[PDB]
Amino acid sequence: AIYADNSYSIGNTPLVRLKHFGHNGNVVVKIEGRNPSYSVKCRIGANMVWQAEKDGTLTKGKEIVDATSGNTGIALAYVAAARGYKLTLTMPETMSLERKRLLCGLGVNLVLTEGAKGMKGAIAKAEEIVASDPSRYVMLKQFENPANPQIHRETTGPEIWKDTDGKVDVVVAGVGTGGSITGISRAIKLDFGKQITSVAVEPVESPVISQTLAGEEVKPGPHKIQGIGAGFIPKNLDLSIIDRVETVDSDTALATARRLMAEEGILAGISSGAAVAAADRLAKLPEFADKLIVVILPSASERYLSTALF
Amino acid sequence: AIYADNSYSIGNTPLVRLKHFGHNGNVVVKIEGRNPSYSVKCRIGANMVWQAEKDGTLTKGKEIVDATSGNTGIALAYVAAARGYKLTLTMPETMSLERKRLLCGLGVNLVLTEGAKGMKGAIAKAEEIVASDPSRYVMLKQFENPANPQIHRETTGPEIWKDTDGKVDVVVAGVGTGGSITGISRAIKLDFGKQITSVAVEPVESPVISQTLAGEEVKPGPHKIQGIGAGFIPKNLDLSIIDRVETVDSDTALATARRLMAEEGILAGISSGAAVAAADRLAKLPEFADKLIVVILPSASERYLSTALF
Numbered sequence: 017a018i019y020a021d022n023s024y025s026i027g028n029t030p031l032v033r034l035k036h037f038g039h040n041g042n043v044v045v046k047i048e049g050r051n052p053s054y055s056v057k058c059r060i061g062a063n064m065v066w067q068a069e070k071d072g073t074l075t076k077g078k079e080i081v082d083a084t085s086g087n088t089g090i091a092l093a094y095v096a097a098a099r100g101y102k103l104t105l106t107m108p109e110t111m112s113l114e115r116k117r118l119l120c121g122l123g124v125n126l127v128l129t130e131g132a133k134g135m136k137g138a139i140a141k142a143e144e145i146v147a148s149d150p151s152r153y154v155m156l157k158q159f160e161n162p163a164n165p166q167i168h169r170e171t172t173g174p175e176i177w178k179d180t181d182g183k184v185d186v187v188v189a190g191v192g193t194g195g196s197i198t199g200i201s202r203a204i205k206l207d208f209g210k211q212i213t214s215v216a217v218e219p220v221e222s223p224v225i226s227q228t229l230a231g232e233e234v235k236p237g238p239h240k241i242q243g244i245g246a247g248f249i250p251k252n253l254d255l256s257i258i259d260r261v262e263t264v265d266s267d268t269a270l271a272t273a274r275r276l277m278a279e280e281g282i283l284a285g286i287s288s289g290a291a292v293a294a295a296d297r298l299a300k301l302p303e304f305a306d307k308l309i310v311v312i313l314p315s316a317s318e319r320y321l322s323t324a325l326f
Numbered sequence: 327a328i329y330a331d332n333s334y335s336i337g338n339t340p341l342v343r344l345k346h347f348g349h350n351g352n353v354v355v356k357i358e359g360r361n362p363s364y365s366v367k368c369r370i371g372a373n374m375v376w377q378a379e380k381d382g383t384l385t386k387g388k389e390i391v392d393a394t395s396g397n398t399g400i401a402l403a404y405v406a407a408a409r410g411y412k413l414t415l416t417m418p419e420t421m422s423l424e425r426k427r428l429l430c431g432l433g434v435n436l437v438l439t440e441g442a443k444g445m446k447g448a449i450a451k452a453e454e455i456v457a458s459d460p461s462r463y464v465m466l467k468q469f470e471n472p473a474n475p476q477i478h479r480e481t482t483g484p485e486i487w488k489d490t491d492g493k494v495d496v497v498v499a500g501v502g503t504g505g506s507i508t509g510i511s512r513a514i515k516l517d518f519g520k521q522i523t524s525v526a527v528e529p530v531e532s533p534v535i536s537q538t539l540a541g542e543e544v545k546p547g548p549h550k551i552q553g554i555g556a557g558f559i560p561k562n563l564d565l566s567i568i569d570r571v572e573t574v575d576s577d578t579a580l581a582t583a584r585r586l587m588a589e590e591g592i593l594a595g596i597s598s599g600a601a602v603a604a605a606d607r608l609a610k611l612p613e614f615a616d617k618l619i620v621v622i623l624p625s626a627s628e629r630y631l632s633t634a635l636f
Binding site: 017018019020021022023024025028030031032033035044047049050051052053054093094095096097098099114117118120121122123178179180274277278279280281282283316317318319321325326 | 327328329330331332333334335338340341342343345354357359360361362363364403404405406407408409424427428430431432433488489490584587588589590591592593626627628629631635636
């Protein structure tokens, strides 16, 4: 069991039973903080690169481009260093010194865009760079790349099936790209044949999944639950496998993350608080009382030292 | 495989082969960042509490006291929250806002001592608090508690034996308390019966182990390799099982940590750089060319965002 590089070491993350949430320990959490770049995104950082290698879109010498300073940026950075690709990430010049320092530490070629342009700035610049030399550059596109949900169908999902001896009844996961919930749901529902309840979680400030499914007006909005609530339906969210959508507000998510640390001794990030707040709600409905609820905790605390988490 | 709390989830950390260090991949690293509080100390945080429970020194209602704002502080904090003990940590008032915030996040009762007194301040204050109510307080004493090396003999060591199919020839580990090298060495040498080479690593700025073994004047000194080089021989370092002592300087350790991130895609902290720099040195001596070298990487990068690592 010696991994030939850090990318192969993804996953096999642990399940812990919660003591101050749910009912008689029906709530259990999967700690995605225990990963090479310390997020769930490592799995997709790994698989998007492996897949682009296998299909020939990524070769020796070609470079990777993207516009993320978030978990996927960090995940891509680790894999690119492990596998010998130069990576360019674009980002607004206004980004935090800390993620600048972290990414520079990882050997990212950081391309800072105009502040005013913000996120749009970064996306366009990466698109421009790709155009400048299409044969030299590859954009992996986490929001639409099937290698994203696929890795979850082959690792994250089966790990849940195995650790719970097939007793998992509910999976609760916050949606960013949608990959986690999609892959996990396909694995357990389709490969293992169990009719679990798949629960997507989004910010009440930006409940575009709920609005879309209700045929209501789509109203995205600002929120602090980093990692989720992109403000649109990403292609990597398979609406067909979602059974329920729960909304959580920023304050509840933050306080719940604090409770996880202070009461459970679990070092979870902002979105982990949101996912658990929603799981706790279902766990306390008599319909879910006797049912095993597994919650994805996407990331670790520390990464949020500069945020409202603290 | 559902852990009844976060303390039971320690270890099972992965081995990764290095590509830009050693010779033909003879250097392999154990990533202790993949742990509940994100350090190697989690194992001892867990075991010191479990052991004090089993022997009756820790009971319901009793409180834990210590004087650490470092990895052991964080580890104790996670376990105490997971298992329902109030924890008091003392520390100089001059400590970083960030570790203050992190520990407060974990529900530590933080007792800040006079700045001028520094470390000595914290130790004395905790000793005072214990004296104030001996029946209410317990100090676990990481430097001398046998539960420290023991956990390494039962988990860390056997994990190395198992992952390498008994092929490990050399273990390289930096010494703080000495628990890691001690426990691992006892496991492989005594329980498995293989005559490996145990290599302790200390800062060249504070090479008290080397000086002591050479019968030279002991000259502890300041350094930046956080986690190691306490400036004395701790009781939890079993000198009898150490075969070799390697010294590394602060700059080399830092640059090596940077290389691990930028070239290997491994998010290691300062002491990981020191441990690898020393492993790389042995790995490039013909006597160790054909031999499998396993290096403990005690902690993850991010924890060092405010340091010279970046």
